[PDB]
Amino acid sequence: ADMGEKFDATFKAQVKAAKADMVMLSPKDAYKLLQENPDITLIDVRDPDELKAMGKPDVKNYKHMSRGKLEPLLAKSGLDPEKPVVVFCKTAARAALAGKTLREYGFKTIYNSEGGMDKWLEEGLPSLDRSHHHHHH
């Protein structure tokens, strides 16, 4: 009555395969091609409160696709299977669902961003954040 350890290994086997499905990059390597090639778009999948409180990537070619998992919003942004795209927030937000799907449909070059939103802010990458110092408590 304690099979928590038993199935845990399997869960990690399934979930990790989702990041393995596509080309795993790093937010710097991803931004590199983003800023140089305005045709390569980054699609961020994260909730509005963290985006508001902590910040989100500041990129010229940025599409934030929310809904439940960008499903109905995908066509709304304007995407074609010959366009290179990268997804942010792989783990918690599950960018793996956002990106690995597209390549499973027929997208040329799709990248997944290792780490997450925390890596964007921390790696010194261009972020759009409401930097405010008017607060003590």
Place this chain on the structure above:
Amino acid sequence: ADMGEKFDATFKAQVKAAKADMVMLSPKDAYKLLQENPDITLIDVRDPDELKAMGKPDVKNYKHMSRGKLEPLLAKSGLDPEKPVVVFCKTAARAALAGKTLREYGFKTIYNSEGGMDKWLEEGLPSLDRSHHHHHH
């Protein structure tokens, strides 16, 4: 040119399969089994920041499993494939990944919560939220 019409339906097919691989129950029926039977645990899989702001389900046996997709926390929660569990927030956070994977391991009864966090608050269900009573302008 544009393949929006094409993949929009496909993405909806894959994302929908995730709700289909679960027993879809409404938060009222979900909380019912939770509050009456403390063996049926509800697992909330969502971000803590929006949780802080909007509120989270205040049930007797609520466990927040926060990782990439609850994988490493599922082992430490004290769960056994003889217990029924329901996953809340099938929307953006996609609790469907939490529950649909578990049935692949042989759980007793796994439910997915129709609607989402919005349905919990809207239904006036037991929630733990910090009333924003510090704003008059």
